[PDB]
Design a protein around this ligand. Structure first.
Ligand SMILES: O[C@@H]1[C@@H](O)[C@@H](O)CO[C@H]1O
Length: 490
């Protein structure tokens, strides 16, 4: 088998699966680990965007009541160190100690904020485990299929601790850990003992190539098999080569800019709103995305299924109202910084250059500040910054509630003083089943989010990959790379 060489935009700081959550971690951790329920993106010949849930580490499951789901595990599944997967490992993955409890907070900083209102899992027998919540939750199934739910081995993880585990991970996945050179490369090798479809690559190397031009030059020279995070502008050059091609898809993620609301200038919504009202999204989509990025009608996406509103009004664009707001805020012309980690996000710097011009036209002076990979500056050094959110559930709960909710980092770390009504709705949507009330509640939260502008949604990006024609691999509609029944060499 051939060794797969990937040229990537970045690498996670840890391979601990929850701590690896980002645009760059899942493409690695999806290989090392498995979940209880997996998504089949290619079901019924779909082009990598199917919503179908299939058994994975759990052979079967059934909801018991409004607060609990019982899982029957696949038997004789082995972790990379030869240890058999049991209900103890699953119970540990979803425990108070490891994930969501007070003791987990130092190990996994966003563990509590990103998890459901869990109670301790109940081990029924060697291959049976019940996962439960303290309050009603109709989200257990989607959460279990998510990137929060990769199964870790109890004994090994406990012996290493979360930090050491992140540097030497052990999972049940099709590929096992070889090496991790901080901010340089991650090397994995085939786990030939895998319970599912056998790995088709002998080795997988994720090599950081921060500059997108250097990444393209690497692919042309034959240094890489697949490269990530390109823009639709790179398409024509790569496809002119008979041995190379581009492979792209709209992903279930949105690019945005956000604010440090602990800063005096952003404590009040006025200037946040003015900056939001001046963003001409259709012009950015034409100029940078060749019409391929999608502009959502609010914090609202098709993957939400029952909580997606196809009838919602477009996010407002109003230059005159933006000008009136800049004057009202008493803004004095002082430059406001906007932090970006180069082009970690496709089109980050070109989008910022366009926005700086749009903002200069409303009387706001914004200046770009770059930071190095894995070198995010202290919070007090930041005003504006770009970010993204992967829409990780088949429900509107993520990411409005885990990121922007009363327990989330936007309010707790970044100082958004959310209206009491918003926080009250977050709590209501957490516990309600789908229906008219829950659907209407998300639309009200969406309206408040637009009035408050704690972040400004830009678009759903069109993820662009480039690969050697002889490397058969299809992108999926999520910020990850799937190789199960989706990797072969010509
Ligand atoms: O990197 C972000 C992460 O910080 C979290 O918001 C989830 O979505 C990802 O895209």
């Amino acid at each position: 088998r051939r060794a797969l060489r990937l040229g990537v935009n970045g690498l996670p700081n840890s391979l601990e699966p929850v701590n690896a959550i980002s645009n760059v971690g899942p493409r690695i951790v999806n290989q090392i680990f498995d979940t209880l329920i997996a998504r089949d993106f290619f079901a019924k010949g779909a082009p990598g965007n199917a919503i179908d849930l299939v058994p994975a580490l759990a052979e079967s499951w059934e909801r018991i009541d409004e607060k609990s789901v019982r899982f029957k595990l696949r038997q004789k599944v082995m972790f990379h160190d030869g240890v058999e997967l049991t209900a103890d490992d699953v119970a540990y993955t979803f425990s108070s100690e490891r994930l969501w409890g007070p003791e987990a907070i130092k190990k996994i900083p966003l563990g509590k904020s990103y998890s459901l209102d869990f109670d301790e899992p109940v081990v029924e027998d060697k291959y049976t485990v019940t996962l439960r919540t303290k309050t009603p939750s109709y989200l257990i199934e989607t959460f279990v299929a998510s990137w929060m739910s990769r199964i870790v081995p109890k004994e090994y993880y406990k012996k290493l601790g979360a930090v050491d585990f992140g540097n030497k991970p052990v999972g049940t996945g099709p590929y096992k850990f070889v090496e991790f050179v901080a901010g340089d490369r991650v090397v994995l090798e085939a786990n030939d003992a895998y319970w599912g479809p056998k790995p088709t690559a002998s080795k997988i190397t994720y090599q950081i190539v921060a500059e997108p031009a250097t990444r393209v030059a690497g692919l042309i020279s034959g240094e890489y098999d697949i490269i990530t995070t390109l823009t639709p502008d790179d398409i024509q050059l790569i496809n002119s080569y008979p041995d190379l091609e581009t492979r792209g898809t709209l992903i279930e993620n949105f690019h945005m800019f956000t604010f440090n609301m602990n800063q005096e200038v952003f404590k009040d919504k006025k200037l946040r709103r003015a900056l939001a009202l001046a963003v001409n999204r259709p012009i950015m989509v034409e100029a940078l995305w060749k019409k391929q990025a999608s502009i959502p009608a609010g914090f609202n996406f098709p993957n939400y299924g029952e909580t997606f509103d196809p009838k919602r009004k477009a996010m407002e664009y109003n230059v005159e109202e933006a000008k009136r707001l800049v004057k009202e805020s008493g803004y004095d012309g002082t430059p406001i910084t906007y932090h970006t980690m180069g082009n970690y996000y496709a089109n980050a710097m070109p989008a910022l250059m366009m926005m700086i011009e749009m903002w200069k036209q409303i009387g706001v002076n914004v200046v770009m500040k770059t930071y190095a990979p894995g070198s995010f500056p202290p919070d007090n050094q930041t005003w504006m910054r770009n970010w993204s959110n992967g829409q990780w559930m088949t429900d509107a709960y993520a990411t409005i509630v885990p990121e922007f909710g009363p327990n989330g980092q936007v309010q707790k770390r970044w100082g958004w003083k959310a209206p009491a009504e918003f926080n009250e709705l977050c709590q209501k949507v957490t516990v309600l089943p789908n229906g008219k009330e829950r659907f209407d509640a998300y639309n009200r939260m969406r309206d408040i989010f637009e009035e408050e502008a704690p972040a400004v949604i830009l678009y759903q990006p069109y993820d662009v990959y480039a690969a050697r024609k002889d490397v058969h691999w299809k992108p999926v509609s999520f910020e990850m790379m799937e190789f199960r029944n989706n990797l072969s060499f010509g």
